[PDB]
Amino acid sequence: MQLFVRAQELHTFEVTGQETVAQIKAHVASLEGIAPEDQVVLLAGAPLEDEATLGQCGVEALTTLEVAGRMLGG
């Protein structure tokens, strides 16, 4: 299950399907050296919930999710 995640740099990710949005954040956060707390994932613009999986979001492969800075934490 290979899909694209558009950060400041475009990256590609092979995901488990039961991959959470928090895991998507963690993957791209490790690449960019940033915090998964300092970002949110948008399915074609739609704000995906951290604890929800890609299956629960209803997103498949060959899709482009985008990372925006709308978060920090507390």
Swiss-Prot record:
Q: What is the effect of changing G74V?
A: Abolishes FUBI-ribosomal protein S30 processing. Impairs 40S ribosome biogenesis
Ubiquitin-like domain boundaries: 1-74
Q: In the UniProt annotation, what is the result of changing G74A?
A: Abolishes FUBI-ribosomal protein S30 processing. Impairs 40S ribosome biogenesis
Report further notes. Lacks the typical lysine residues that participate in Ub's polyubiquitination. However contains a C-terminal di-glycine signature after its proteolytic separation from ribosomal protein S30 and could theoretically be conjugated onto target proteins.
What does this gene product do?
Answer: May have pro-apoptotic activity.
Q: What is this protein called?
A: Ubiquitin-like protein FUBI
Q: Which organism is it from?
A: Homo sapiens
